[PDB]
Amino acid sequence: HWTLRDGAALLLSHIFWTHGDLVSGLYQHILLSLQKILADPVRPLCCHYGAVVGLHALGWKAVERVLYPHLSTYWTNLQAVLDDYSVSNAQVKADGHKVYGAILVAVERLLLLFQESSSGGGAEPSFGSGLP
Amino acid sequence: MFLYNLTLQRATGISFAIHGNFSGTKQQEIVVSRGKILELLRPDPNTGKVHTLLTVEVFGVIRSLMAFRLTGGTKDYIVVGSDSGRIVILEYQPSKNMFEKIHQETFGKSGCRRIVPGQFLAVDPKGRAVMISAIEKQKLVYILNRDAAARLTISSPLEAHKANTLVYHVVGVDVGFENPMFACLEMDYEEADNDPTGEAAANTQQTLTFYELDLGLNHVVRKYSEPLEEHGNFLITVPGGSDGPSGVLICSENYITYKNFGDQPDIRCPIPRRRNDLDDPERGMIFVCSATHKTKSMFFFLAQTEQGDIFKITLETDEDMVTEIRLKYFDTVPVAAAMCVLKTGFLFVASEFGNHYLYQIAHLGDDDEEPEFSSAMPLTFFFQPRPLKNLVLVDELDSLSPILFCQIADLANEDTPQLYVACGRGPRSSLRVLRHGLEVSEMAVSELPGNPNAVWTVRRHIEDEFDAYIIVSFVNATLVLSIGETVEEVTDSGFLGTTPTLSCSLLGDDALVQVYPDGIRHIRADKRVNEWKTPGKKTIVKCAVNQRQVVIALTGGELVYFEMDPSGQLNEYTERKEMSADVVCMSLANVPPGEQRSRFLAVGLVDNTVRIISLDPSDCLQPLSMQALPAQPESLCIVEMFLYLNIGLQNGVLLRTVLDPVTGDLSDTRTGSRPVKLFRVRMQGQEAVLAMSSRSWLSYSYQSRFHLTPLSYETLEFASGFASEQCPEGIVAISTNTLRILALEKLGAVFNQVAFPLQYTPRKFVIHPESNNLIIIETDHNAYTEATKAQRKQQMAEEMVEAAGELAAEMAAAFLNENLPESIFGAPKAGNGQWASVIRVMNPIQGNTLDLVQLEQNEAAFSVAVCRFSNTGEDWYVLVGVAKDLILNPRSVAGGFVYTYKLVNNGEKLEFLHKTPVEEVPAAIAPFQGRVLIGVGKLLRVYDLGKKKLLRKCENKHIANYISGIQTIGHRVIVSDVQESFIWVRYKRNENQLIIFADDTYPRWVTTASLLDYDTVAGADKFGNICVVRLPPNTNDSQKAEVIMNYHVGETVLSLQKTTLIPGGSESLVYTTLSGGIGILVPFTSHEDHDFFQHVEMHLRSEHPPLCGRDHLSFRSYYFPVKNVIDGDLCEQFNSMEPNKQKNVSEELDRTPPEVSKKLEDIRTRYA
Amino acid sequence: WLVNQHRDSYCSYMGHFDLLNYFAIAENESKARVRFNLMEKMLQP
């Protein structure tokens, strides 16, 4: 049932780039609601995974400044995977998008630079080996 | 929309091999290491055959494998180095036939990261400390100690980290009686990052750092720091102390150096060169492996170079130092990764690309004709090639070469689909054909007039190993025969076989029993006629032979039992049981030599209600129970591995039942609409069954498990065993109006193959639809051709003539007369821009070639396709791409050409027609709608047949990457990008323009693509990521493609294809891998089918951890998460669990363990 | 960044056995020469 968010995310990006800059006074409120639902540990993993591409794959101007300062919103579930618990949804599936999060950034630079690469090296080393 | 992972073939490539004693016996065995599969095998000096002991998948990438020994112990331990952040210790139990985990110590992160050890692993040969370290910044020391209970204990690793340091190789150096001593090559790169000019890159030498450990003060300190001159690769473990000096042999580039701590000067010894070598002198020659042989008399080592030359290092040691190093030419073997020398004169060479062989040492090579080479002689030596002369072919295995392309289709007149594998390496390549069944071998073919229907095999004695009488029966006649290696008609048998004999068994020690419906005549060895007449005119329908009992069945449902009296006569029971049906089958198991006799008896009836008949006199001729039957049976038998009940019917079914008076399990499999006859056969000592259908079916037992492997043969009606001097283990199978003898040498479980010699590694091949032919293109890196080698030899011959040595140069004739084979002695070809392009058409039915068309040396073929044009009629065209000026390290190309062939006589003769230039080497050609499309690099164009040049109709430039694959269909064109996942392009007919409307968000290194239907497009990956992309129905025929299933196999998959495997089932995604395994994907039908296996996957992750300590979910979801795919590899290990744990799992699922295993085998039963 | 990403890519080639197997196929070399070349390229990526 994960096609529901994929269609919503595709439409979310569609309205972001089509005409969302004419009289859009909510253009900042849509961004504001993103960290209100994501940057809080009281929410479950289902909605936490629902905002993994709603911020990164929307540009790079006001995106990198958000992803960097957070430490207690991504490292918590990374080391909470070897627990032998009930059914999960994003304990290993959310790691796919964070690897993808270092793809577009590297492509833009090929055409925080050293610190970002060093920080990503301690999280996933296969990202720089599968695609450069 | 759901998939199930199932594999049939496994990785047969050896990456790491060790030698030692792990089973506790006195016979040596080898433990091989695959990429992620642990296989155990042992040799056999008696028969020279090697059989697999146990194959368990560890679900983890193994990076190293080695062993050690304890002081005063008797059993070795297994240490496995993987990509995880933990080390494991294994102890195989021969009785349990399983690997038991001893310790599990997690120290750091897992995966293929920078700070993960596992690649390099070394131990003190005395058995006190072991070293594991990563490439950089990490060095760990584990201390092994045991208590008074003879139990091995492991302590915490020691912190010996050193940042900004590069580790080349770690080896365990044995130095007399002292602390475990370690030598390694270290490198510093601090100056390289601080010198942008480039001066720090030059003249950068490495050191040989020696580490000393203290067991009392618990510290690690660097003792020696000795810089080197040239770069090193690995060290040879040379034992010291009593036997040999305590030193190490460092292999270098074109040189070898011995270095020992103290007052030992360095020894320099150059490596010789083969006479008048055609290779580039600027190229080097290095070593790939080093074997250690521990012999009480003398010690010597073996090495291997790139050219397959074996040099033995013999040391004339002093009291403490060494004198010199000696070298000699001994043997010639193909290119191998690592070899292990075994005791009692055995040498196993484990190849890295090709088949695995097993050589036997026959001669030590003492005082040969070729002089040895040492270091004391000054000055650039040379050696002459020599044949093997020492090793012979003993054993061979069905090792699968890495596969670059595969294709499954129907090319023979039979309905069984054949599998074609294009693999190999250069001259050792072979386009082998895979067949599902066993290897059918014939020894003698004879013709017998009449209609043979039964052949018997009676031995002289029960415990003998040779036969005494063979009888062949007919519908009306019978002839007697005997075996004397001059088999003809025998006369003094004394059988009087005028009447059709139903059966010829062995009742007495050397007596035979013949069955005829006019009376039973016992044929004794002594001149005694024990003829029993049949009361009345009634006849007999079947028989039941036994070692100590005689059972018959008269017409109308009448049963008479005979008992074998030890005095010499026979008795008859005083009661006949009445039955309501007609006897259709009869069977009885053999009397156990240890026990008294058998009790369970099964009688087939038309009423389809089989009843168990007791054999004891207390309850003789009495009903016991009843069991329902589907239809009228045809044959029945009782197999003992533990007895089992087997039921055969008149149609293509095979029913199996456990030994139980009450009805139990009911397992069936398709066997045909033919009467199935089940016989008694012997293989591997245990009993087995042999059913008959349109194809012969065999079901034997292996590792306490019953399989179902059919036989590649036509319809048969009768079969029996065979045992003589020529073939101790054979099977006799009579055919239509002829006599044939079969044998079973190779086990041949699945995927038998036949080899065919080739010249270069084929890339792709296309099946000719009409004349059933193939088109094969060949290209290899640094390859030559016949013309280039011929002119090089002539130029080389002229140069030596020009040299005019002291005219006195008579070796010109000998150089051109004696030529060495390329497949076994290697290929002496060098250069940078040297290639080959061989186009060959081979008939799959035969093994010979049809035409050989060669091309220029600087030309290579990467793609081939068959196209049609509307201007011509039913003519078939062949187009082969040409590569020009390929440069590896920098990106600099020059272009290519496309060759058009007439294809004279539908794939029997090729001729040159014309040429056309292109700006880039083509990669994939796919015609559609009567025209041809060739992807020229980043530019996508549509071509058409012209007079001199291909007419251009459209041009595309939106593709900013290299096109690696083009798949076309009647509506759209699917483009497989090397960087992007998929590009969907539609080409119009009236507009004539390539339109790009959709793409994919996920970047993938797509190697190949396949089409399942109109909407689904599959794709592979360089690492083994298989995904299927579904496009929404609303597409502009803004369109970012979604993904419904993503799964990582863990091994490189280079081909995807979906077809029907066996007639009578559904299709499945059959894909092979680069390791050499074949995996299938089983689709699901109902919701509960996926739910039950989902619960099994959830339960087995916690109830059965992997052997090497690797997390199951993240290992499969390494690159991409696993979606809509259920792993069946973990479910296959359900039979390798303790019964108490299995009982708990079954009760958790509210089922029984027999039923759980039935569904596990049912998945393979349906689609395989 | 260039140094960090290069050192995280070339060093991961040896961990995978099939990636090493693929490297030994594209070139007429053995697994020994392949692992030496990647190890000698660490001096200046």
**DSSP state letters, B379-418:** ---EE-----SS--EEEE--PPPPEEEEEEE--SSSSSPE
- Amino acid B92 reads Y
CA distance C19 to chain A (A): 11
Question: Residue B180 and residue A100: Cα distance in Å, rounded?
Answer: 46
Taking the CA atoms of residue B5, residue B11, residue B15 and residue B16 in that order, the dihedral angle to the nearest 10 degrees is 90
B-to-C residue pairs, Cβ atoms closer than 8 angstroms: 90
Nearest CA in chain A to B108: A122
Strand ranges of the sheet holding B255-259, from the earlier edge strand across to the other edge: B232-237, B248-252, B255-259, B267-270
Tokens encoding B1144: 């708990």
Give which of B668, B657, B752, B745 is closest to B710, Cα–Cα: B752
CB-based contact B604:B623 (threshold 8 Å)? no
Tokens encoding B841: 């058409």
Beta-strand relationship, B859-860 and B877-884: antiparallel
CA B267 to chain centre: 44
Indicate which of C13, C18, C33 best probes the interface with B, i.e. most B CBs within 10 Å of its own CB. Answer: C18
DSSP B769: T
Give which of B915, B876, B1075, B948 is closest to B423, Cα–Cα: B1075
Q: Does B461 touch chain C (CB under 8 A)?
A: no
Question: Residue A129 and residue C15: Cα distance in Å, rounded?
Answer: 11
Question: Residue B258 and residue B314: Cα distance in Å, rounded?
Answer: 12
How many residues appear in chain A?
Answer: 132
Q: Does B1121 touch chain A (CB under 8 A)?
A: yes
Nearest-Å Rg of the Cα atoms of chain B is: 35
3-state secondary structure of A123: coil
Question: Residue B319 and residue B186: Cα distance in Å, rounded?
Answer: 31
Question: Residue B304 and residue B1142: Cα distance in Å, rounded?
Answer: 49
Question: Residue B490 and residue B979: Cα distance in Å, rounded?
Answer: 77
Give which of B1134, B1126, B1121 is closest to B1095, Cα–Cα: B1126
Number of H helices, E strands in chain C: 3, 0
CA B198 to chain centre: 49
Q: Does B1095 touch chain A (CB under 8 A)?
A: no
Question: Residue B739 and residue B449: Cα distance in Å, rounded?
Answer: 10
DSSP B161: -
Question: Residue B513 and residue B527: Cα distance in Å, rounded?
Answer: 14
Q: Does B334 touch chain C (CB under 8 A)?
A: no
Using CA atoms, how far residue B1073 sits from B431, B1076, B1077, B1082, B1126, in Å, is 16, 6, 5, 17, 19
Nearest CA in chain B to A82: B1111
Give which of B576, B621, B572, B578 is closest to B601, Cα–Cα: B621
Give which of B225, B210, B228, B234 is closest to B268, Cα–Cα: B228
Give which of B645, B601, B652, B659 is closest to B630, Cα–Cα: B652
CB-based contact B1022:B1069 (threshold 8 Å)? no
CB-based contact B588:B601 (threshold 8 Å)? yes
Tokens encoding B322: 């060494």
Residues in Cβ contact with B50 at an 8 Å cutoff, skipping those fewer than 6 apart: B41, B42, B43, B44, B358, B395, B397
Give which of B385, B308, B272 is closest to B814, Cα–Cα: B385
Question: Residue B917 and residue B943: Cα distance in Å, rounded?
Answer: 13
- Amino acid A91 reads Q
CB atoms within 10 A of CB B51: 11
Phi, psi of B41 (to 5 degrees): -145, 155
Question: Residue B1010 and residue B1069: Cα distance in Å, rounded?
Answer: 10
Residues in Cβ contact with B1084 at an 8 Å cutoff, skipping those fewer than 6 apart: B2, B3, B4, B1090
What is the DSSP secondary-structure string of B883-913?
Answer: EE---SSS----EEEEEEE--BTTTTB--EE
Residues in Cβ contact with B305 at an 8 Å cutoff, skipping those fewer than 6 apart: B271, B285, B286, B287, B288, B311
CB-based contact B1076:B11 (threshold 8 Å)? yes
Q: For helices C17-26 and C31-40, what crossing angle results, to 10°?
A: 100
Nearest CA in chain A to C12: A129
Q: According to DSSP H, which parts of B746-806 are helical?
A: 786-803
Tokens encoding B1063: 């007639």
Q: Does B1098 touch chain A (CB under 8 A)?
A: yes
Show the CA angle centred on residue B1010, arms to residues B1126 and B1127, nearest 5°: 10
Beta-strand relationship, B120-123 and B129-133: antiparallel
Tokens 């292990």 label which residue? B340
Tokens encoding B390: 């020492």
Beta bridge partners of B153: B145
Chain C residues touching residue B288 (CB < 8 angstroms):
30-32
Give which of B864, B669, B645, B692 is closest to B775, Cα–Cα: B864
CB-based contact B597:B549 (threshold 8 Å)? yes
3-state secondary structure of B265: coil
CB-based contact B778:B837 (threshold 8 Å)? yes
Chain C residues touching residue A106 (CB < 8 angstroms):
5
Q: Is B885 left (phi over 0), alpha (psi -120 to 50) or beta?
A: left
Chain C residues touching residue A132 (CB < 8 angstroms):
5, 9
Contact B1022 C22 (CB under 8 A): yes
Q: Does B285 touch chain C (CB under 8 A)?
A: no
Tokens encoding B521: 């005549």
Question: Residue B766 and residue B774: Cα distance in Å, rounded?
Answer: 6
Residues in Cβ contact with B853 at an 8 Å cutoff, skipping those fewer than 6 apart: B839, B840, B910
Nearest Cβ partner of C15 from B112, B168, B1051?
B112
Give which of B457, B416, B454, B453 is closest to B434, Cα–Cα: B416
- Amino acid B425 reads R
DSSP B1145: H
Tokens 């790079």 label which residue? A60
3-state secondary structure of A77: helix
CB-based contact B883:B904 (threshold 8 Å)? no
Of chain A, the end-to-end C-alpha distance in Å amounts to: 33
Taking the CA atoms of residue B927, residue B932, residue B934 and residue B939 in that order, the dihedral angle to the nearest 10 degrees is -120
Tokens encoding B162: 């050193």
Method: cryo-EM
Question: Residue B673 and residue B652: Cα distance in Å, rounded?
Answer: 5
Burial of residue C24 (number of CB atoms within 10 Å: 0-12, 13-18, 19+): buried
Tokens encoding A112: 């925080």
Indicate which of B164, B353, B400, B829 best probes the interface with C, i.e. most C CBs within 10 Å of its own CB. Answer: B353
Taking the CA atoms of residue B890, residue B826, residue B774 and residue B1023 in that order, the dihedral angle to the nearest 10 degrees is -50
3-state secondary structure of B17: strand
Question: Residue B409 and residue B229: Cα distance in Å, rounded?
Answer: 58
Tokens 């590792």 label which residue? B703
Question: Residue C20 and residue C9: Cα distance in Å, rounded?
Answer: 13
Chain C residues touching residue B286 (CB < 8 angstroms):
32-33, 36
Nearest Cβ partner of A129 from C1, C4, C12?
C12
Question: Residue B756 and residue B775: Cα distance in Å, rounded?
Answer: 16
Contact C11 B136 (CB under 8 A): yes
The domain in which residue C9 lies consists of 1-45
Taking the CA atoms of residue B52, residue B436, residue B1073 and residue B100 in that order, the dihedral angle to the nearest 10 degrees is -30
Tokens encoding B576: 């006949």
Question: Residue A95 and residue B129: Cα distance in Å, rounded?
Answer: 38
Helix then strand then coil, % of chain B, to nearest 5: 5, 40, 50
The count of domains in chain C is: 1
Phi, psi of B800 (to 5 degrees): -70, -35
Nearest CA in chain A to B116: A125
How many residues appear in chain B?
Answer: 1168
Using CA atoms, how far residue A115 sits from A131, B1, B1144, in Å, is 19, 42, 51
Give which of B185, B200, B68, B90 is closest to B135, Cα–Cα: B185
3-state secondary structure of A9: helix
Contact A87 B1113 (CB under 8 A): no
CB-based contact B173:B183 (threshold 8 Å)? yes
Tokens encoding B555: 């017409």
Nearest CA in chain C to B288: C32
CB atoms within 10 A of CB B295: 10
Sign of CA dihedral B114, B116, B117, B119: negative
Of chain B, the end-to-end C-alpha distance in Å amounts to: 20
Burial of residue B330 (number of CB atoms within 10 Å: 0-12, 13-18, 19+): buried
Experimental structure resolution, Å: 3.7
| Subunit partners of chain A (3 or more CB pairs within 8 A) | B, C
- Amino acid B842 reads M
CA distance A131 to chain B (A): 8
Residues in Cβ contact with B711 at an 8 Å cutoff, skipping those fewer than 6 apart: B437, B438, B440, B695, B696, B697, B698
Q: For helices B1139-1148 and B1087-1103, what crossing angle results, to 10°?
A: 140
Beta-strand relationship, B512-516 and B519-523: antiparallel
Sign of CA dihedral B1145, B1151, B1154, B1155: negative
Contact A132 C12 (CB under 8 A): no
Tokens encoding B1161: 């085998």
Show the CA angle centred on residue B736, arms to residues B731 and B739, nearest 5°: 45
Question: Residue B158 and residue B165: Cα distance in Å, rounded?
Answer: 18
Across B322-379, where does the E strand assignment appear?
A: 322-327, 329-332, 336-342, 346-351, 357-360, 373-374
Question: Residue B584 and residue B542: Cα distance in Å, rounded?
Answer: 7
Of chain C, the end-to-end C-alpha distance in Å amounts to: 12
How many residues appear in chain C?
Answer: 45
DSSP B204: -
Give which of B982, B1009, B987, B862 is closest to B933, Cα–Cα: B987
Question: Residue B1130 and residue B503: Cα distance in Å, rounded?
Answer: 48
CB-based contact C14:C42 (threshold 8 Å)? no
Question: Residue B462 and residue B601: Cα distance in Å, rounded?
Answer: 23
Show the CA angle centred on residue B1144, arms to residues B1140 and B1147, nearest 5°: 135
CB atoms within 10 A of CB B656: 18
Three-class SS string for B26-78? CCCEEEEECCCEEEEEECCCCCCCCEEEEEEECCCCEEEEEEECCCCCCCCEE
Using CA atoms, how far residue B116 sits from B84, B182, B684, C16, in Å, is 7, 20, 46, 13
Burial of residue B489 (number of CB atoms within 10 Å: 0-12, 13-18, 19+): exposed
Using CA atoms, how far residue B1037 sits from B942, B968, B1015, in Å, is 19, 14, 12
CB-based contact B55:B80 (threshold 8 Å)? no
